[PDB]
């Protein structure tokens, strides 16, 4: 009877482990029974509790394949099935109240951000993300990394690159599993190269060179080169060739964001070092891009803050700064201040540890 | 998929359409609370109107969303103040948890309010709508015929 | 519930004591410098 309760539970976990294509024959047919299994004498008990005996991951694996819409087949106004999942996951979400829930709770948020990333709208993300903070000391190294990956994706549409760079770089330094070195690793790399492109600071893909397929690399190089050399012409023809690629990965958003960046990168390489830079040169470069908006674009260029310049067109010179800092006041001290904060948090962990 | 059909009717003109919108929203508030959280000032303006009579329903919807935010105390006021939207007589995750909080609120207060005045419970000092929910908790307890619970909450 | 009160009590004694550890620790810092100086 003690044994009976326990025996049901061990059986429920066991059925969940088996069904990743062993003694199985249709993940979707079986879903009904998996929902059935989950909720009595398991999901029910845990009301103020969280564990790694309850795991969204097992159910995630199951649910993910159905969302290729090949079992739905787009015969229908909306999926029922995803709505059901979402209803049920949100039902857990209530139960969590940030007292001991950070564990399983965090997976549900990964799932929720994924559905927005497939085809929803990513403005709803903001609250979940905030709710979802509370000291994290029970989430696994792979889980941290996936969450960051999804979070980074959110940030990028919202036009927040720096924040996304920090998270993706922090992600790849979790996960000693050899199972997240496989295709997942490739996806992660993709996103780190995209963020590098957006900032437009972009280094060469050297590091990536012995950790991706040479097939992946060459197109990936092609994009980076397009930005770096600073041609619109080069960039457009690279988009044209590797159309299937940018579509496939779903990082088609680049084509909007990057175009304005590419043209700016192209002025930047042309030097702005001395007290005046003659107007004719800068006009010449721009003339190739567009010669009806040479004043409008240079003005916009300055406004952005990427580069900064002064123009007289009653002298017809463009006046510029070095683009090199000074050390004589608070701004290097602010870097000193960030570093000491980082050290203290780290110190607190070593002592605790 | 979207709460957007519903939310559109919540801002549309005529009282009737807004009454329908409240009840349309109502059914699925819990799942979609995130989106509906932005529309809270609008919902709150119905509540404050004492000419519009589905004020209570707008309040109820506000409470669910505040709960999901972390503002448990705020929603507890708002359900009482609606004047029917506090019902313990149903059994829910919403209801159980905000009742847990309500007792906590009265007990904390009850420490302070005894020290000033030892007749407070006897009186309007802690408002009747709160005192009723607490008094019903006592009755709930007594029915289960395990006295240590009833006496506990009251002590 | 008579049990819950009791358990809350046990925990409370414990709390006063967790602050108490800290207060002896602060004190020891002062005495450590003075001793090292003395030598």
């Amino acid at each position: 009877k003690t044994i009976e309760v326990t025996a049901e539970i061990n059986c429920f976990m066991h059925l969940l482990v088996q069904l990743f294509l062993w003694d199985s024959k249709e993940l979707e047919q079986l879903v009904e029974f998996n929902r059935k299994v989950v909720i009595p004498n398991l999901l029910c008990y845990y009301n103020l509790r969280s564990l790694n005996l309850i795991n969204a991951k097992l159910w995630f694996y199951i649910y993910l394949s159905h969302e290729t819409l090949a079992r739905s087949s787009e015969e229908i106004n909306s999926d029922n099935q995803n709505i059901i999942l979402r209803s049920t996951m949100m039902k857990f979400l209530k139960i969590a109240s940030l007292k001991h829930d950070n564990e399983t709770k965090a997976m549900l948020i990964n799932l929720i951000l994924r559905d927005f990333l497939n085809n929803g709208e990513v403005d709803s993300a903001s609250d979940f993300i905030s709710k979802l903070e509370y000291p994290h000391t029970d989430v696994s190294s792979s889980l941290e990394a996936r969450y960051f990956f999804y979070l980074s994706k959110i940030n990028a549409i919202q036009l927040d690159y720096s924040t996304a760079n920090e998270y993706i770089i922090a992600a790849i330094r979790k996960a000693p599993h050899n199972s997240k070195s496989l295709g997942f690793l490739q996806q992660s790399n993709k996103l780190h190269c995209c963020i590098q492109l957006l900032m437009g600071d972009i280094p060469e893909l050297s590091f990536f060179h012995q950790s991706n397929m040479q097939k992946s690399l060459l197109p990936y190089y092609h994009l980076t080169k397009a930005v770096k050399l600073g041609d619109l012409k080069k960039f457009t023809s690279t988009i044209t060739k590797y159309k299937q690629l940018l579509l496939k990965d779903d990082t088609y958003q680049l084509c909007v964001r990057l175009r304005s960046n590419v043209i700016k990168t192209g002025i930047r390489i042309i030097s702005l070092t001395y007290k005046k830079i003659s107007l004719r040169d800068i006009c010449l470069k721009l003339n190739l891009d567009s010669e009806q908006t040479v004043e409008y674009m240079v003005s916009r260029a300055i406004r952005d803050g990427v580069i900064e310049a002064k123009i007289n067109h009653e002298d017809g010179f463009i006046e510029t700064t070095e683009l090199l800092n000074i050390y004589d006041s608070e701004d290097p001290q602010q870097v000193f201040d960030e570093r000491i904060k980082f050290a203290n948090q780290l110190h607190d962990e070593y002592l605790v540890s | 998929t979207t709460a957007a059909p519903l939310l559109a009717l919540l801002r549309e003109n005529q009282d009737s359409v807004k009454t329908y919108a409240l009840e349309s929203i109502n059914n699925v508030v819990d799942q979609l609370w995130s989106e509906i959280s932005n529309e809270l000032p609008d919902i709150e303006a119905l509540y404050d109107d004492d000419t519009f009579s589905d004020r209570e329903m707008a309040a109820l919807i506000a409470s669910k969303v505040y709960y999901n935010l972390g503002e448990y105390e705020s929603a507890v006021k708002y359900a009482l103040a609606a004047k029917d939207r506090f019902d313990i007589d149903e059994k829910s995750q919403f209801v159980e948890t905000i009742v847990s909080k309500s007792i906590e609120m009265y007990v904390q207060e009850a420490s302070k309010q005894y020290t000033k005045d030892e007749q407070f419970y006897t009186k309007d000092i802690i408002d009747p709508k709160l005192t009723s929910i607490f008094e019903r908790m006592i009755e709930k307890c007594l029915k289960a015929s395990e006295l240590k619970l009833a006496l506990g909450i009251a002590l | 519930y008579f049990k819950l009160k009791k358990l809350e009590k046990e925990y409370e004694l414990l709390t006063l004591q967790e602050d108490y550890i800290k207060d002896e620790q602060r004190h020891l810092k002062r005495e450590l410098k003075r001793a090292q100086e003395e030598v």
């Binding site: 103020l48 605790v352 | - | 809350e8 414990l14 550890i21």
Partner: peptide
């Protein structure tokens, strides 16, 4: 009742961090 369980739980969490400090206090 549920709320009373939660108050106790948070005390249990704080203690472990103290235990690691009970060790540090002894070294001083």
């Amino acid at each position: 009742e549920q709320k009373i369980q939660e108050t106790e739980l948070k005390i249990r969490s704080k203690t472990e961090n103290v235990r690691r400090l009970e060790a540090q206090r002894n070294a001083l």
